[model samples]
Target: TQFAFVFPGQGSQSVGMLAEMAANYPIVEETFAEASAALGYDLWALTQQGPAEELNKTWQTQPALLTASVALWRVWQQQGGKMPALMAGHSLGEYSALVCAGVINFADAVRLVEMRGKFMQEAVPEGTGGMSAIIGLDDASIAKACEESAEGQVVSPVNFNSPGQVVIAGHKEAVERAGAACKAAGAKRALPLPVSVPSHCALMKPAADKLAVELAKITFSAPTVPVVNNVDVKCETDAAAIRDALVRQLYNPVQWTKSVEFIAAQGVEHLYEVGPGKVLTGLTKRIVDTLTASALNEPAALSAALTQ
Candidate 1:
């Protein structure tokens, strides 16, 4: 079967999510230790013993989630988890996908995401901005809802997850209003997410501006397996295009649905979500009418995939 490995982004993280693997697996320990040293923070303590609030911070959450996912990816690799023809990630998970594809080194990824997340949080202050998920609504319907309800604010579709799950980001009032409007317009769920900033909207211009400087200093190599970028939902193999997509990701829509379609059109048979959560795996199943999508979060799933 044609397989493609995927990674998850934020909202999948929580205190103690990876502590079990870290405690039992030395592979996980080494990866987390190296990342913690590079960031000069005790990541193990934060995720394992966190008050939850601290681990949820943008800067800490980005690397914490990336490091945990990468660490698990390494474990799967050790168990003879065969490489797929393609790899992709959602939002911040793209960095981990790049690292796995050999486009970026581990330490460089650690530093870049740390900076990326910090800039994203600093782009807009807390309480002034937020994000909300609009389930059971098509992209066009959600966009119209945001436009009609924004009231001159910056509400816009940020993540196009699966067919009917679209997320919007912008001012808190705008998000609230949009959520109400979407519910009234026949959406299944229009729940407010617990994000502190309005990412992927025009408000993220400042963060995108600062992230460009950091990205310019980093060196990028062409990925081994093509990575489906969030900006356009296309497989980007050119080093320059990959870098440009990453730089623009802060204010760009996550075309997750289009990315899945792109992979399927390339004859991908199985979509494997390799991370702490099964969010993308579920989306992949929904995207293709639930045919042969699997999630690999722990050792059993990794071993099963290896033998399959």
Candidate 2:
């Protein structure tokens, strides 16, 4: 296949995003309206004139990012953008992939991730558990550092983001110990992140289990297109398998690099990042040389993608 789509997870949202597109497409705000009906709040307003803090919360961010992605997908459909043969997403973006691929209802997904964010937050006490970005270190050494630093606490690489860029998560002290070790072992920097939820690590297992019951209540369909899952880098269309992947994804490393490689190996020529930020677009460039990456967030970019 010549087309592929990737959705972003977190660390991509910003206030005032999609304003340009909203001005051009009614589908943009219309989507936020639907999500708002489900959320009982003005999600568009939060993105437009955020208290900034509220927009950044996990519960808020999850629903908002999903809204942005679905809105843009609506626009893409209305304009007759090419359908991707296969798709994938970064942490929370996996939900976006499923929705776009016709595996779940948009409203159902909105409520789902909102609860997901809540469970993730309540998994750890507010400030005790966190994540850190380790730059200039290989994955093996980073894992070694985390292993050596862990003294009866949770600390391990959670996001294998790209070459020389890995994100680790655990208790604050364990994260600190590993960060120091990564730096001492010759990393350029080990920066602590501001997120309250330490995502995709053993710390999230309790939250993952809580989410299982919620998943049981919702209906899921086979994906209209194959969606490469973050947990296993496999395309899962079976409802049960997809649900299992989503559950496991919470406490496992997001295999972003391998997921991209799988798509590239499938002979995809143009890869679009269908979401708010250019984060995934940029990462695709670093991960695969054979595919062209496009960010379809703005009117110009979207039109270019549609016409080309």
Candidate 3:
């Protein structure tokens, strides 16, 4: 049975997300330790006993989720899990995917995303910009709403999460206008998300520019497994192409539906969402009918995947 491994982005995080897995695998702890050293704080402790608010911060959440996902990847490897035919990640999860694919070093990835989080935070003021998810809306309708609602401020379909779900982001007023337009255009629900920064929108260009400079300083290696980047659905292993794609992804729409379809077209019959939550798994179900999806963050889930 051909398979792929996918990772989740920011919202999948919660306090003590990988605590259970760490109990069964010492590598999980060591992974957190490496992240803490790179980040200069007690990331493991934060995940273990979070004030919730602090752990949810963009800077903290990026590295923390990356470490958690890679730690779980280590456990999966140690248990003799077979290598997947393809790999991909959503937003910040993409950095984790790169690390697991040997396209980027873990320590360097941690540092880069820490700076990425900082750049994104500094790009726009809090509450002045935000994101909203529009459910039960088609792509053209959502895009039309964004274009109509722009009105000199930025707002667009940033995350094409699934067939009927898309997330829009930009200036707060523009985002709200887009949301209302989406509702009027026959959306089931258009609700605001709790994200502070307006990610994957034109507003993120400054952040992306800053990230490009930092990314250029880091080294990217050819992936051990091909990665389907967020900006495009193509499978890429070229180091230069991967670097360029990661930089462009900051302000480009996450073509998640297309990414899943690309993987399914490649003959992958099963997918494992090998990260903190089942967000990617849920989306995969909607994107591809022929593929079976499962989340493997906990020990039992890992055991089940191994058995299969």
Candidate 4:
């Protein structure tokens, strides 16, 4: 079983996620209990009975997604699933990966994400910053578009999602400008995302600086499993180094494509998305066409991955 695990980041949460998994696996419920205690609120309730708007808040979304990922992590471990060769998460998903890897305690991570989400939101004013997906353009063209569109602003490519897919984030006007520029540069589509946070760009530098203090307070250990960090596309064992990765990742492009390529270099045959949604599943296929990638949430898929 030459497999590695990847955790989903933002934009993967829904109100009724893991309902079936929670019904079938008690660990999923108990796991939410821990998260609820850490955050002093009902995360499970919001996740199950969301009003749609609040659950989508970055502050709420971060812990919810992390808890869901960890819940699946517990289910997999209790079911005697094979440990992954390495782990990496996309954007906010990296914290989920760190918790599952046992580098940080669950409660600390829950609170950590809560703070990060708040800091991320407060980093830039609403409507001033935005993000957009630029499809069909190579990274070079996208970067060129962002640089040209910046016009002294902060437009830049934030997520190199796959070979032909990249996300740009910065000033709203600049993002819109780059969207047009990318389209003019032969991009198939440059669609703006419906979110407030312009994360993984220089705009998040203020947020990253603030999250740094919170990250410093938490005592971290070497990952029990190797972690392919997003910032450097390399594994880190030093606690401080790992913390640096978490801080810088806020304002740096999520090198997901390179991260998968790094795993490919290790000869990993399958990439298990150990969390909710099939977002990473599709991204993984786009990044490496031959690597078999699957998400482990339902018992059917969980059962299959547990065997092979």
Q: Tell me the tens digit of each residue's lDDT in model 4 across 98-186.
A: 99999999999999999999999999887799999999999999989888999999999999999888999999999999999999999
Between candidates 3 and 4, the lDDT winner: 4
The residue pairs found clashing in candidate 4 are: none
User: Which digits, one per residue and each the tens of the lDDT, describe model 2 over residues 204-255?
Assistant: 9999999998998889987778888989999877888999999999999999
Against the correct fold, how does model 3 do in TM-score?
0.98
TM-score of 2: 0.98
Q: Residue 179 in candidate 2 has what lDDT?
A: 98
C-alpha TM-scores of all predictions = 0.96, 0.98, 0.98, 0.98
Error of 4 at 110 (Å): 0.1
- Angstrom error at residue 302, model 4: 0.6
Instruction: Give each model's whole-structure lDDT.
Output: 0.85, 0.91, 0.90, 0.92
Candidate 4 displacement at residue 204 in angstroms: 0.6
Off by over 4 Å in 4: none
Tens digit per residue, CA lDDT, model 3, 82-129: 899989889898899999999899999999999999999999876799
- State in Å the error of residue 16, model 4: 0.6
- The alpha-carbon lDDT assigned to residue 294 of candidate 2 equals 84
Off by over 4 Å in 1: none
Candidate 2, pairs of clashing residues: none
